[PDB]
Design a binder for this molecule. Sequence first.
Ligand SMILES: *Cc1c(COP(=O)(O)O)cnc(C)c1O
Ligand SMILES: *Cc1c(COP(=O)(O)O)cnc(C)c1O
Ligand SMILES: COc1ccc(CCC(=O)O)cc1OC
Ligand SMILES: COc1ccc(CCC(=O)O)cc1OC
Lengths: 394, 388
Amino acid sequence: MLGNLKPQAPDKILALMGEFRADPRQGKIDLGVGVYKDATGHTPIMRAVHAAEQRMLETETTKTYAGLSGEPEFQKAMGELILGDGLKSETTATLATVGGTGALRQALELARMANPDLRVFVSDPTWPNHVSIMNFMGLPVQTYRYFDAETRGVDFEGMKADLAAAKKGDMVLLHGCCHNPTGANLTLDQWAEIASILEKTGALPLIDLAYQGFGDGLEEDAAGTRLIASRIPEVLIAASCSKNFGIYRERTGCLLALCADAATRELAQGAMAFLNRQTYSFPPFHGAKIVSTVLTTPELRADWMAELEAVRSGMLRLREQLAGELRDLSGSDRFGFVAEHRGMFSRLGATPEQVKRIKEEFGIYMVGDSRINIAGLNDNTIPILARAIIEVGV
Amino acid sequence: MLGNLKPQAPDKILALMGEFGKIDLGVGVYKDATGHTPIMRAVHAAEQRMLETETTKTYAGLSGEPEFQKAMGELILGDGLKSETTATLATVGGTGALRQALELARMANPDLRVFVSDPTWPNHVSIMNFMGLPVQTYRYFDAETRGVDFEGMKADLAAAKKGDMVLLHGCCHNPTGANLTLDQWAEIASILEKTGALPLIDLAYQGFGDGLEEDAAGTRLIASRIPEVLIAASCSKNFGIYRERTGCLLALCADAATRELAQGAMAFLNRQTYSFPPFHGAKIVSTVLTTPELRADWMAELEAVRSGMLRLREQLAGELRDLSGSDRFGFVAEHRGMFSRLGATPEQVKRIKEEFGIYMVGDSRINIAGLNDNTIPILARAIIEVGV
Ligand SMILES: *Cc1c(COP(=O)(O)O)cnc(C)c1O
Ligand SMILES: *Cc1c(COP(=O)(O)O)cnc(C)c1O
Ligand SMILES: COc1ccc(CCC(=O)O)cc1OC
Ligand SMILES: COc1ccc(CCC(=O)O)cc1OC
């Protein structure tokens, strides 16, 4: 029977890796990486995180089955982290999931469970995993203009124009902050207008919050998400702890369902718990416990925020340097957008030909859509990248 | 939109878990004399060692780590492990491996039906219903003898066709505690090969029956006979790491090409569901399995657990024999595993819990690991008073 199986395509990330490793050039650089890397090219375990694992190793007395939808300490902590003082427990349903991706899938299942004729609107472009999951579920997918290839900024007129076509019941997927892969983001005023459009059309917003803390800070990054939650009655939030806590492999995230009333919250909560059960039953414990421990322990929480901040400022300085270099070399303010983008990614806006030429001539690797990881840059690599960009006619 | 959500039905076993001189005999979790579910020694040493060795937490393997996969395959199939034809997928527990198994098979055959035992783990049907898959049942439990209705089982299985999936419990059948002998397994392989039905083996208690190797005997027999088989393994109970959510799905294929296909579809399945699988428990398992000193202590502790429960069964059987002046309840010493179905009807079961405070699953399923010297005579007596 298994022979009938249709061949499924590889991740592609590995294909990028295999090529890079095979490159015999000693000066080769890799900007296609999708995780945070420090000065030495390592992806360290945050201090507080290592502190929580020591604490857990000495205090945990059993590993029996726990909460089906997550432990309360984690649910409350995450909600407060994302929504701050605005968290209305009475109408908020929470589900610990296997990473933010698990959160996305579950939100998709829940929405389709409540509305069979669901259509999803995704930005152009967006995280490929989004479209992939949707295609897999058989859900209809619609696109809304987002990245402006010329200015490398947000095409807000087009975004509004396209979202205006959403009907009540449809789902609109928004990146809370640090748009992956572009790096181009919406300002709070633009979020306010998006809110109006969402109220008008009656579409359900699904906010993918995976980089809280890598943009302008923890609170600032959650600002957009908080405006939507306060103005829109029903909101779905898929939060990831992978990057801002550096626990990628632990698989920790959570789905937040902001409802109109307590009765609906009870309905959504029951369905979420049901969904976990029909997929894997209980969610992973380790990472979630690390997170609640850091968040509830004043000392740890303080150190984590402090470390996250160092990371953020470090990347922000890298952006300014690259931008500075590009300005000095270009004799213009064309690549200024690099300094304006937020998050660890940025789409340069180079054509696949330019991307291929940059690799063949300069030994610099990046995703085929010209997305680079800011964290993979440094004092030695910045000048090279800048030169390459200017030389290939970007 | 969300207000349109229909209320869902809660899980019975876990419902009791929430309800609980209270005597908890519900949820299938091992407990020690003091009613505690301890962290196994080797598992603890593995976590310490891990705290010192791990330098990063970056994303890892989509299908799980090479070490976990090789270790799991060897633990299950022993020297019957043919890597060139076996695909392995790390999942979120044994339950995740089941769901993944049903998704994999359904992809390969949109018209598959699943045969489950009568009775079977409630969660099996639940997921199948959710996925909208056709469920047939095969006779398995003999309400009279409390053993297995093997004649009825063979009867219903022969009616299965190629493309159908037969879900079997590798050992320690949940909730009955009634198991097949190796002779019975060979017989079953004959049926499976004649009808061409794909067996899906739920292996969640390797180690609680007769032994690590012995509990895998049936599974190893089907694997040597049937060219294509699926196994959903759970490390929740034999490693005592329930909450870590670790287990895996093995796809035994007839050839390398099909193996490549299966492995691809499996990785794709994790990617579209939650991307990467959880690392902590899987790392614990491979650390224990590949470290001689740790594996030896794990086996010792697991054997100690196994032997203990077996002692409890014999005690409960004896206690009852004295209290009933009969040997009707003899079957309790014959059953193997964590559970054993008594027979008490729904009304009897409910009476027992609402006054004696002893909770067992509505169908009279008791977790024998929940008993001890103190509570055994109490249980024996309580059922005598509930009569029949
Ligand atoms: C990383 C990421 C996620 C979540 O990843 P998880 O590892 O599953 O937590 C979700 N959305 C985007 C855009 C991401 O970059
Ligand atoms: C324990 C068990 C499983 C798997 O449990 P997980 O916690 O998901 O590993 C599967 N089937 C049966 C019959 C079980 O008892
Ligand atoms: C495999 O799926 C992923 C791919 C890539 C990433 C890293 C983020 C990125 O490269 O866009 C995460 C994934 O799952 C969490
Ligand atoms: C809710 O699903 C479960 C119920 C019960 C158990 C414990 C095993 C049992 O009691 O049958 C596990 C579950 O998922 C792993």
